[PDB]
């Protein structure tokens, strides 16, 4: 499912070593470290990112992203 | 075999920790994490990327790429 599609509004590095990102108006977190430097770059240059997941509410995990 | 030569239309980070990339008309995946920053970089700077596999249909895997 395409949960959100847009620019990364902001991003948080968390104490549990997960990475949170804010797309459209909703927050999403990923526990995959590999996604950290890729996502911070998409945010740097306003790359349109699209978070994919099974649970699409704000506060949900993902481990799938399309970079446009 | 030279499977697709062109610039990366999109990238995808997958749930199984493989990276997917669209070149020419066709999707390809790699299971090599080393290639993830290298491919995101080629996508960011419009590099002509050339994807080398022994199997060329869309949905095939690769572990060898030329960056121009």
């Amino acid at each position, epitope marked *: 499912a395409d949960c959100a599609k847009g620019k990364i509004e902001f991003s948080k590095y968390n104490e*549990d*070593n*997960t990475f949170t990102v804010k797309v459209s108006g909703r927050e999403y*977190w*990923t*526990n*995959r*470290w*590999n996604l950290q430097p890729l996502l911070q770059s998409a945010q740097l240059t306003g790359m349109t990112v699209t978070i994919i*997941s*099974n*649970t699409c509410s704000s*506060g*949900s*995990g*993902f*481990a*799938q992203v399309k970079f446009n | 075999a030279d499977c697709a030569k062109g610039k990366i239309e999109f990238s995808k980070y997958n*749930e199984d*920790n493989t990276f997917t990339v669209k070149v020419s008309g066709r999707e390809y995946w790699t299971n090599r994490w080393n290639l993830q920053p290298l491919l995101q970089s080629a996508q960011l700077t419009g590099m002509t990327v050339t994807i080398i596999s022994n199997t060329c249909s869309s949905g095939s895997g690769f572990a060898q790429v030329k960056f121009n």
Partner: nanobody
Amino acid sequence: VQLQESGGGLVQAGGSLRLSCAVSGSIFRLSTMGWYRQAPGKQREFVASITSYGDTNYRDSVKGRFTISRDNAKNTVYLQMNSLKPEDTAVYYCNANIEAGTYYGPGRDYWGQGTQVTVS
């Protein structure tokens, strides 16, 4: 690291229970949460699981009846058991299983004390 499952006592066949598991927040987002079960005498069995990105899975005998969910804010897995059968009687163990792609060491696999569910 600590797993506290709760819920579940006795229920007459054809009814519903909701088990919950409180997971210590240091590993909750890092793992696919699971539920195993063990009947007296037999050996422990998969029941359901839920990855960090909401992907679910169920043993066959349970599909269509049970559903598993996460409340990511409260660090808990819920298993909703519906229209139960006598074959579902067991001790139900909460299980936390670190996903491939995050690191945490050197654990990786964690279990709860269990919770007894009886159906007659």
